[PDB]
């Protein structure tokens, strides 16, 4: 991308989850229409990707859109779907192992992303980039209750089973909440909230989240 | 006044979750042994109860201890279990509808609390007080094998509106994965035994500021 001065970290998370929230508030604050913020969320994702590749983060999961989000106005649904498609396509121009997880048994799921619903190497690969597209926490848990008979097997067979435990979850837009992102993988996740809206992303947001992470005692109830 | 005037709130959560974390760090900071913090966590719980009753909170769920917590040394297990028993027994002397949710199929689950594993009205009731005792997220979700989502072990406990965690960590530690999917989370930096009413007031000011 371009040259940065990235701090040195004593400890790095294996898996970062990103909640790129605040697109509508960002747009309204700039006197744009609510749905116009999503198109300004793509370059921030690429800056996150570039930083994570440079420091050697193993896996990053981006919250794209939920089944609940598809209750919003058509004009917003078209805007955030278009922006999610573009984000996956942009990572597909770089070096990544791409996975899209979400309900593909829905008219809402974009045909453009079906090819990424199995993990796909692009360029030199290495870093795992996941996207949650038409994802729902209820759909994810209930996927298991149907397609797993046993109980101990249920957990291993949730819809998002390819996505491992989230070490660090970073949420833009100043809300401290999961919005149903990966309930199983996020039970022990250390959560960092950035007050600025996602389109106002700065590398310093990610650096401060990583400083937060390396400062945590990760005890897992022990 | 002696006790801070309880502020008047323009919005209130129906259901507050409490994670009373930091007992061991609190004890170690005082030069006590790791296990000596838990007994100093009981009165804070009663202060939360008193304030929630006064402002008219419908439901409060306390995180007591988890299956993961039973990995800890036996001296710590006995100390936190003893403190959880005493907490429920103290609420049992007041006005509450008490429910204990947790894995009762374990010699770790205290016999004293079996009677509260069905919702129990004490005094005038009018507030629902839940305790998670030998609770595990994994046990909760997998319990359904006993519609499946509506038959999780914690199914009686509704959506958490506001989650307040003491001890400075911003994490769920597996508290009620289903009910916490949209919960607004407020972290208090002070360890649970350093509870002050202003901790709770600031959490509720945070909640009424959320959209
Ligand atoms: C790696 C890259 C390139 C991009 C990652 C970011 C991304 C998915 C951008 C796409 C548009 C976007 C902001 C969607 C998020 O919207 C939801 C959250 O608030 C629902 O409204
Ligand atoms: C009372 C209670 C169950 C607290 C949760 O924190 P924890 O210390 O048990 O977990 P963690 O190690 O994830 O902070
Ligand atoms: C499991 C439980 C009863 C949590 C309360 O604090 P703690 O025992 O986790 O103490 P700390 O967070 O300081 O280790
Ligand atoms: Mg939002
Ligand atoms: Mg703790």
Residue numbers in the entry:
A (entry chain B): -2 to 219
B (entry chain A): -2 to 143, 150 to 214
Article sentences:
MM_0014 from the methanogenic archaeon Methanosarcina mazei is known as a versatile cis-prenyltransferase that accepts both isopentenyl pyrophosphate and dimethylallyl pyrophosphate as acceptor substrates. Cis-prenyltransferase (cPT) generally catalyzes the consecutive head-to-tail condensation of isoprene units and produces (Z,E-mixed)-polyprenyl pyrophosphates. MA1831 and MM_0014, which are orthologous cPTs from the methanogenic archaea Methanosarcina acetivorans and Methanosarcina mazei, respectively, unusually accept both IPP and DMAPP as prenyl acceptor substrates. The overall structure of MM_0014 is in a ζ-fold, which is similar to those of so far reported cPTs.
As a result, surprisingly, by replacing the FG ligand, two DMAPP molecules were found bound to four of the eight protein molecules in the asymmetric unit. DMAPP molecules were accommodated in both the prenyl donor- and acceptor-binding sites, and a Mg2+ ion was coordinated between the pyrophosphate group of DMAPP at the donor-binding site and the α-phosphate of DMAPP at the acceptor-binding site. These DMAPP-binding subunits were all in a closed conformation. The DMAPP-binding protein molecule formed a dimer, either alone (one of four dimers in the asymmetric unit) or with an FG-binding protein molecule in an open conformation (two of four dimers). The distance between the C1 of DMAPP at the donor-binding site and the C2 of DMAPP at the acceptor-binding site, which corresponded to the C-C bond-forming atoms in the head-to-middle condensation catalyzed by some cPT homologs, was 4.3 Å. This distance seems somewhat long, which could be why this structure could be solved without the complete processing of either a prenyltransfer or a hydrolysis reaction. The interaction between the C-terminal sequence of MM_0014, TLGG, and the substrates of prenyl condensation reactions seems weak; only the main chain nitrogen of Gly223 and the hydroxyl group of Thr221 likely coordinate with the acceptor substrate DMAPP in the DMAPP-binding structure.
